[PDB]
């Protein structure tokens, strides 16, 4: 319906099986709400040894991706996407991913995700081939594959059919009623819907407050939420 | 040598092939610097339909992981790890992952990673079975598998043998010398090692400053770095 097409440039396309063949993302794929198409720069080399890396100008420890096979793979993917596909490079230098960014990215019907390996890609390719850099967080990984997959899984949740607000989740409980002495909170057994809604909300406000206070600053809380937050805080002191 | 053992509890162990069979992490695995062992809660069920989910107390939209098969899988993994294994739950409510956290986590020789599906796990299991909650970032995914894999890849980089400071990376360049009109910066061709070191460092300082200014506040810059930052800023105005 409002499905999504995602192109992937990667030296390890088979990695993407982790999201295409399992769980919710796997189902989204099989029901054609999500399409993940991979192009491997190795297929675009011409030398006998299928070389995909190259030496950094200026010396240095590592390698970069070799420009020609990487550039060609990107062009082929763009031609498959038609007009309107946004090309994203996953990197530490990129805009930090958060839920607002995920909802932004989900608006696009077509994405091309370029996954860096070695010490990354030539600076000039970013300028000519890439629309936006994104980071999933302030940490270094061996490849852009996992951040690509992470991005894909996150936006996939916003596609209609795939499934069935500033705050951390409340605690959840299932069977049994007593577990290693710990009991389930009586309000959740009471059956009183509205009392349950308020407890969960208070919990979220309390949990957000104690674990991630800065998240509360971005929010314009409701009167109810202000009340429920004030209460939780009173009970804490 | 200083190898690492990682236990994984997951309804989709085959997802972990993305890191165990490819690239640098794949090599670390094959050379026995890294070991990733999976236990699937589905194997610990006893009913005919191998049920791994259960109904939330208090009503609500989704399901949680069923406590018994999840709890049993965790216990089996702990017994495989012996003493000293830290059990981590990947979740949005967790401590935010960043490089400092990765270097912290890398200190452990044994990790058990519990991957939530559905609306997650019973609150009481966190209290009894989990040592630390971690988040890879402020975004929601369909499973803890990708955040687990992300964690694994990140700490793996700190194991000796696996491979060959507050700032974003400098630009990188490889062949050709001219690409769509864009040339490689002459300093990188000059062969002057020390001039090259300073340019790369200035770039990092400039890039960090323009993209992620707050990262600069955490740092106690060197005199050189203060000088190189001041310069970059002068040239910007
Ligand atoms: N946080 C993220 O979004 C993220 C993304 C990728 C990534 N690695 C891929 C990568 C991409 C771009 C540049 C360098 C690199 N790396 C190459 C391998 O060496 C480290 C540098 N790491 C983290
Ligand atoms: N940022 C992270 O580290 C991260 C980790 C996991 C994750 N999802 C697994 C999960 C784990 C715990 C609780 C709920 C859930 N989810 C179940 C699926 O529905 C959403 C809630 N998402 C993001």
Swiss-Prot record, chains A, B:
InterPro entries (UniProt xref): Alpha/beta_knot_MTases, tRNA_m1G_MeTrfase_C_sf, tRNA_m1G_MeTrfase_TrmD, tRNA_m1G_MTases_N, tRNA_MeTrfase_TRMD/TRM10
Record GO cellular component, one term: cytosol
Provide this UniProt record's keywords sorted from A to Z. Answer: Cytoplasm, Methyltransferase, S-adenosyl-L-methionine, Transferase, tRNA processing
Q: Which reaction does it catalyse?
A: guanosine(37) in tRNA + S-adenosyl-L-methionine = N(1)-methylguanosine(37) in tRNA + S-adenosyl-L-homocysteine + H(+)
Q: What is the annotated localization of this protein?
A: Cytoplasm
- EC identifiers of the protein: 2.1.1.228
Q: What class of enzyme is it?
A: transferase
Q: Which domain of life is it from?
A: Bacteria
What GO molecular function annotation could you give as one example from this UniProt entry?
A: tRNA (guanine(37)-N1)-methyltransferase activity
Q: What is its main location?
A: cytoplasm
**Pfam families associated with the record:** tRNA_m1G_MT
Sites binding S-adenosyl-L-methionine sit at 89, 116, 136-141
Which terms under GO biological process does the entry name?
Answer: tRNA N1-guanine methylation
Q: Which HAMAP family does its entry note?
A: TrmD
How this chain assembles, per its entry, is: Homodimer.
Report the family membership: Belongs to the RNA methyltransferase TrmD family.
What the entry lists under PANTHER family is as follows:
TRNA (GUANINE-N(1)-)-METHYLTRANSFERASE
Primary role? Specifically methylates guanosine-37 in various tRNAs.
Name the record gives this protein: tRNA (guanine-N(1)-)-methyltransferase
């Amino acid at each position: 319906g409002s499905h999504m097409w995602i192109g992937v440039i990667s030296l390890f396309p088979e990695m993407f099986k982790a999201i295409t063949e399992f769980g919710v993302t796997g189902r989204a794929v099989k029901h054609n709400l999500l399409k993940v198409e991979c192009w491997n720069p190795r297929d675009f080399t011409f030398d006998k040894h299928k070389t995909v890396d190259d030496r950094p100008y200026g010396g240095g420890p590592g390698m970069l991706m070799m420009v020609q096979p990487l550039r060609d793979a990107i062009h082929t993917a763009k031609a498959a996407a038609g007009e309107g596909a946004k090309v994203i490079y996953l990197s530490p230098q990129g805009r930090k991913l958060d839920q607002g960014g995920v909802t932004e990215l989900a608006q696009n019907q077509k994405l091309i995700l370029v996954c860096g390996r070695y010490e990354g890609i030539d600076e000039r390719l970013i300028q000519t081939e890439i629309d936006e850099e994104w980071s999933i967080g302030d940490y270094v990984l061996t490849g852009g594959e996992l951040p690509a997959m992470t991005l894909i899984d996150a936006v996939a949740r916003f596609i209609p059919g795939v499934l069935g607000d500033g705050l951390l989740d409340c605690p959840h409980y299932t069977r049994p009623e007593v577990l290693e002495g710990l009991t389930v909170p009586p309000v959740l057994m009471s059956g009183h819907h509205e009392e349950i809604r308020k407890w969960r909300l208070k919990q979220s406000l309390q949990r957000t407050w104690l674990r991630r206070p800065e998240l509360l600053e971005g929010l314009a809380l409701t009167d109810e939420q202000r009340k429920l937050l004030k209460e939780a805080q009173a009970e804490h002191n």
